[PDB]
């Protein structure tokens, strides 16, 4: 409703996308597309931006005030964590060469 909290959803809205992205880039990790540029883009562009997107959401106290939104990012950062883990492992099992 509020413009301030509205701006938060904009960050979350991206996180939500970045979330699917991580799982997207993570799904290809060690699978054909497996390329240094990918893992690099992932850790140097995706995750860094996804998590950075969190700090932006977490920075907005409205995230702690708004119960609904509070869960929004929480679900993203949460699901995002699973992605990094599922991929981080795969990346260790599917080395490039």
Tokens of 17: 């996308």
Number of domains observed in the structure of the chain: 1
| Dihedral sign for Cα atoms in the order 87, 90, 92, 97 | negative
Tokens of 4: 């301030």
Method: NMR
CATH number for the domain that contains residue 76: 1.20.58.70
3-state per-residue secondary structure call for the chain: CCHHHHHHHHHHHHHHHHHHHHHHHHHHCCCCCCCHHHHHHHHHHHHHHHHHHHHHHHHCCHHHHCHHHHHHHHHHHHHHHHHHHHHHHHHHHCCCC
Tokens of 18: 């970045």
Cα 91 from Cα 30, distance rounded (Å) = 6
Cα 34 from Cα 47, distance rounded (Å) = 17
C-alpha distances out from residue 51 to 8, 30, 89, 92, Å: 14, 22, 19, 21
Burial 61-88 (b: 16+ CB within 10 A, else e): ebbeebeebeebbeebbeebeebbeebe
Boundaries of domain holding 59: 1-97
């Amino acid at each position: 409703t509020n413009q301030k909290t509205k701006e938060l959803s904009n960050l979350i809205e991206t996180f939500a996308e970045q979330s699917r992205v991580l799982e997207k880039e993570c799904t290809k990790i060690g699978s054909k597309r497996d390329s240094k540029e990918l893992r690099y883009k992932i850790e140097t562009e995706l995750i860094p931006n996804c998590t950075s997107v969190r700090d932006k959401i977490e920075s907005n106290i409205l995230i702690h005030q708004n119960g609904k939104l509070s869960a929004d990012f929480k679900n993203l950062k949460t699901k995002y964590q699973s992605l990094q883990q599922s991929y981080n492992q795969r990346k260790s099992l599917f080395p490039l060469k």
